């Protein structure tokens, strides 16, 4: 069907996959760094959610190079995906307003 909704759906699936792989890779990256808290899977999934939404409480965060690269991918993907939803909503509203006008 319509491209904007296909892309939204696709954005959401991709984001879920990035969260899950980010959790797994953050733990991998961070274990072996003294002081690191981002080292068990359940809180890593939480950490990646709060990073993707860009909420970032500061209860958890990577301290290594690769953990931080992982973090950046997660941010970019959360911001991008949510941006894509906004874009798709604007396409929807614009098309319906063209109609309501008779255009």
């Amino acid at each position, epitope marked *: 069907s319509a491209l904007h909704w296909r892309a939204a759906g696709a954005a959401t699936v991709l984001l879920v996959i990035v969260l899950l792989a980010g959790s797994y890779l953050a733990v991998l990256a961070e274990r072996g*760094a003294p002081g690191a808290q981002l080292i*068990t*899977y359940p809180r890593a999934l939480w950490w990646s959610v709060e990073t993707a939404t860009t909420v970032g409480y500061g209860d958890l965060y990577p301290v290594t190079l690769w953990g931080r690269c992982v973090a950046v991918v997660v941010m970019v993907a959360g911001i991008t995906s949510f941006g894509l939803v906004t874009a798709a909503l604007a396409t929807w509203f614009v098309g319906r307003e063209q109609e309501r006008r008779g255009h």
Partner: antibody, heavy 118, light 108 residues
Framework: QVQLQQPGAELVKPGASVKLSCKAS????????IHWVKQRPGHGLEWIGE????????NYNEKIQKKATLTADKSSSTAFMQLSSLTSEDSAVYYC???????????WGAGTTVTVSS | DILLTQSPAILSVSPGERVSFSCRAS??????IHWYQQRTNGSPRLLIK???ESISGIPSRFSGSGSGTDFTLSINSVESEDIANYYC?????????FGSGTKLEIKR
């Protein structure tokens, strides 16, 4: 059934090496870590290192001199610890344990008694 | 690394009494503390996870409490099979560390 199988004993000569095994069974996930823990007679539990067999990345206790090298075999489901150049300081029970990536050792091997003697 | 202090090192108690083992962390670690029992010549056995969570197969006798830096393993009504060494373990920060151990002793 015994989730983690270790040999009961290894005898090793000063300066020689040994390779301990730990055969895992039961539910196995990519998230699983295998830890190794050293206990000297009468003393407590000391953490040596960990390996994630699904990836082969290993990390080590930095506070102590590095005698160990951890490896794992995905097909035979076996974690190995190579102890090199031992002294009587290295004579101990070495346990393996499995952690499901959530911080605690749900299950332990029975341990391998390592004696360093001529 | 996080230091885990367990004092007293030995604890004497009379049968059926309530006993409390102490574990203190050198910094704040929420509830990321787990407790192990090790009998003479046995391997460690998990009793309590995340400071207060039951494991199945462990007698209801055993409970845990605490958060931050101060943790307690408790046994309602001690009995003979509880004679063991008791260790705490932290998973808040890398590397995981163990406490030094409390031995439980019964006065019969």
């Amino acid at each position: 059934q015994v989730q983690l199988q270790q040999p009961g004993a290894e005898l090793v000569k000063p300066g020689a090496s040994v390779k301990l095994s730990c055969k895992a069974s039961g539910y196995t996930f990519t998230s699983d870590w295998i830890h190794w823990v050293k206990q000297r007679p009468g003393h407590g539990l000391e953490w040596i290192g960990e390996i994630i067999p699904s990836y082969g990345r290993a990390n080590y206790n930095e506070k102590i001199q590095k005698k160990a090298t951890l490896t794992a075999d995905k097909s035979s489901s076996t974690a190995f610890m190579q102890l090199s150049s031992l002294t009587s300081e290295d004579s101990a029970v070495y346990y393996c344990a499995r952690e499901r990536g959530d911080g605690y050792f749900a299950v332990w091997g029975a341990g391998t008694t390592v004696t360093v003697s001529s | 690394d996080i230091l885990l202090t367990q004092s007293p090192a030995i604890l004497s108690v009379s049968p059926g009494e309530r006993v409390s083992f102490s574990c203190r962390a050198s910094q704040s670690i929420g509830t990321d503390i787990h407790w192990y029992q090790q009998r003479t010549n046995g391997s460690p056995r998990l009793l309590i996870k995340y400071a207060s969570e039951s494991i199945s197969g462990i007698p209801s006798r055993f409970s845990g409490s605490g958060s931050g830096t101060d943790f307690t393993l408790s046994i309602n009504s001690v009995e003979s099979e509880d004679i063991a060494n008791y260790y705490c373990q932290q998973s808040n920060r890398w590397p995981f560390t163990f406490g030094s151990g409390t031995k439980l002793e019964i006065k019969r």
